[PDB]
Design a protein around this ligand. Structure first.
Ligand SMILES: CNc1nc2cc3c(=O)[nH]c(N)nc3c(CC[C@H]3O[C@@H](OC)[C@H](OC)[C@@H]3OC)c2[nH]1
Ligand SMILES: CNc1nc2cc3c(=O)[nH]c(N)nc3c(CC[C@H]3O[C@@H](OC)[C@H](OC)[C@@H]3OC)c2[nH]1
Ligand SMILES: [Zn+2]
Ligand SMILES: [Zn+2]
Lengths: 360, 360
């Protein structure tokens, strides 16, 4: 029987690592991409913020938990909810206790605190639970970044204690802490130290992919990822485009999530090894090639760019579904190639070849 | 090797029949439902009117024909295009030659005539080609219904001659004639006689499902279907709801098409043996049963009403795709049950049981 949580590094190249997380519901191969569950992957995401508002966490628990609800019996990761509250909610009120906000769907009042976030995630039944943090806005002054990070670290301890108080959660799920500190090395160090003192099963790099751009994101990763425990997984939240993933793996990241595959799939963008393409453009109306020349997905085995272009232009849902299936599969082929290249000691060459072709 | 076209009736009960159409690209089991190709089925529909306008029939032929374009190597049926021209186009101009109209997409002028309709269908590469007819509006006076039907019969002969002039089409495709005459028995008889004198591979009942309602449609079918050759397939165009299909089979119809499965699937309606349900309604938010209790489709094997409700309410494309997959599968299970019940001599009981449950 698999353990509750065990991360093992099978091979390394530079700062890059490849290995496995073993959990009760399955093995997660790393580096991992974690797609939205409502879109192969070893773990999917539940959308805590949406589920809080519709149908509510209690109701999900009444229906048997997310795994039953979604028909997915493998691992599920949930965020702690505050990022989306601050991003999407109205008339939010912040305090040391947490955040209160009004639901855009029906005006009901909702609060989120470390304790309530952990309880929501418990009711949803997720396997990887995120600590309740504050994603500091960018840019931030040093003073405000420090004050925000300090609050997040107090909330990380409250998250740890709430998770440990729930026997079923403590025995069957895992808890990740989230590093903050904006772009400032000293604050990132203080945050890493505070999280390691509390102790978590994995460590996320928070506070990035919030408008800083790739050069700055990579600069922050260069010093931030080494501050985290080496023997635990490293999750970069909100990232990203394929080139962001490759560079983040080069800097020691093991886990990724982002809206791009599905957002692109619904908006006419297909990922390929030669970069993204806008399938609605007339230049694809007579292109008999598959979406990508090397892709093994079922869409690329059967249908042309011309036909997918036609479906999307005609407003047919089949078109968006085919685009999304291809994009999901592309991302998982990217991660497989990353894992294999690290395991084979040729990831540096892979990254160079990837960039030369993706940006040609 | 299969023939170009051969219809064989394997069993009968009342006016109902079950059997097979053999064509070069496949066998079609009848009674048959023929889904839109852009949505198992033995034949799918190509949308002649849309394809004429985007990308155009010549361009489809350049891309290899519909079968290649759509990735479907089995039979395809296309309509002749006028129904949609009169239904959707602007500033149409009608004459004995055909109809001219302006494309809503780009203002280009297009004409349709019997000869051009057959040529378009040739370029698309369909296997079952419909004669170019005029679907008389409902209601129609006897005089106007007669004048319209007479023009359609002249156009049926022109369609026959155009089809026969194209060797590849004549040798590999089939041509159906379309009966008109509105709701008038004498005109339906004149139309049937004219079509049989020309000679077609199959016969459609046109001019129905245009606002007359089920009682009147069935009344017209009661006298109209027996007028067609018994030994050829009978196609009721534009029909319909499950209860319309059952009653039309009871009246001698062998083939059906309609927008309902896909339109419903995109608009939150799921077909079930207990009637249609509106999955977005709050009454399904905690319903753990599948869409239908007896359905064998992959959606009903895996997911609940509650989850499909959730996806559709969240605006997720996955929800509409699951609804459509279920609805397509429901329609094909309906047709299989129809075929088996006729073959087993229990279709009368099936129809009675179907109606008692569907309308409970
Ligand atoms: C786009 N840039 C981006 N930077 C982020 C930074 C943070 C952060 O510092 N803290 C937390 N807790 N969450 C973050 C998030 C949200 C990730 C979730 O966003 C959700 O998608 C909307 C997704 O779950 C369906 C995922 O949860 C696993 C970020 N997103
Ligand atoms: C809804 N009621 C309805 N009554 C109809 C009657 C006629 C008729 O008398 N003549 C012709 N030629 N076509 C008819 C049609 C259109 C069927 C096509 O309609 C297309 O869907 C929009 C479908 O092809 C994707 C199909 O072509 C195979 C009808 N539709
Ligand atoms: Zn593909
Ligand atoms: Zn089903």
């Amino acid at each position: 029987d698999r353990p509750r949580f065990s991360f093992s590094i099978a091979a390394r190249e530079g700062k890059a690592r490849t290995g496995t997380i073993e959990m009760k519901r399955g093995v997660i191969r790393t580096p991992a991409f974690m797609p939205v569950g409502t879109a192969g992957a070893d773990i999917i995401l539940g959308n805590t913020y949406h589920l809080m508002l519709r149908p509510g966490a209690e109701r999900i628990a009444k229906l048997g938990g997310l795994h039953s609800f979604m028909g997915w019996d493998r691992p599920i990761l949930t965020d702690s909810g505050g990022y989306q509250v601050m991003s999407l909610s109205s008339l939010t009120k912040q305090s040391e206790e947490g955040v209160t906000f009004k639901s855009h769907l029906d005006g009901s009042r909702h609060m989120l605190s470390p304790e309530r976030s952990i309880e929501i995630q418990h009711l949803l039944g997720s396997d990887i639970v995120m600590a309740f943090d504050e994603c500091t806005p960018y840019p931030a002054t040093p003073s405000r970044a420090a004050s925000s990070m300090e609050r997040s670290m107090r909330w990380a301890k409250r998250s740890r204690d709430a998770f440990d108080s729930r026997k079923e959660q403590a025995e069957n799920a895992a808890l990740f802490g989230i590093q903050q500190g904006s772009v400032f090395e000293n604050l990132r160090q203080q945050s890493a130290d505070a999280l390691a003192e509390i102790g978590f099963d994995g460590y996320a790099v928070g506070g990035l992919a919030v408008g800083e751009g790739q050069d700055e994101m990579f600069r922050v990763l260069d010093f931030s990822v080494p501050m985290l425990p080496d023997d635990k997984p490293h999750y970069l939240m909100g990232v990203g485009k394929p080139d962001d993933i490759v560079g983040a793996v080069e800097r020691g990241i093991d886990m990724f999530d982002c809206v791009l595959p599905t957002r692109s799939g619904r908006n006419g963008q297909a990922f390929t090894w030669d970069g993204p393409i806008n399938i609605r453009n007339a230049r694809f109306s007579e292109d008999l090639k598959p979406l990508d020349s090397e892709c093994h997905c079922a869409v690329c085995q059967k249908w042309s760019r011309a036909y997918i272009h036609h479906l999307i232009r005609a407003g047919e849902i089949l078109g968006a579904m085919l685009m999304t299936e291809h994009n999901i599969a592309f991302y998982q082929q990217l991660m497989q190639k990353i894992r294999d290249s690290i395991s084979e000691g040729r990831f540096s060459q892979f990254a160079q070849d990837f960039r030369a072709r993706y940006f040609a």
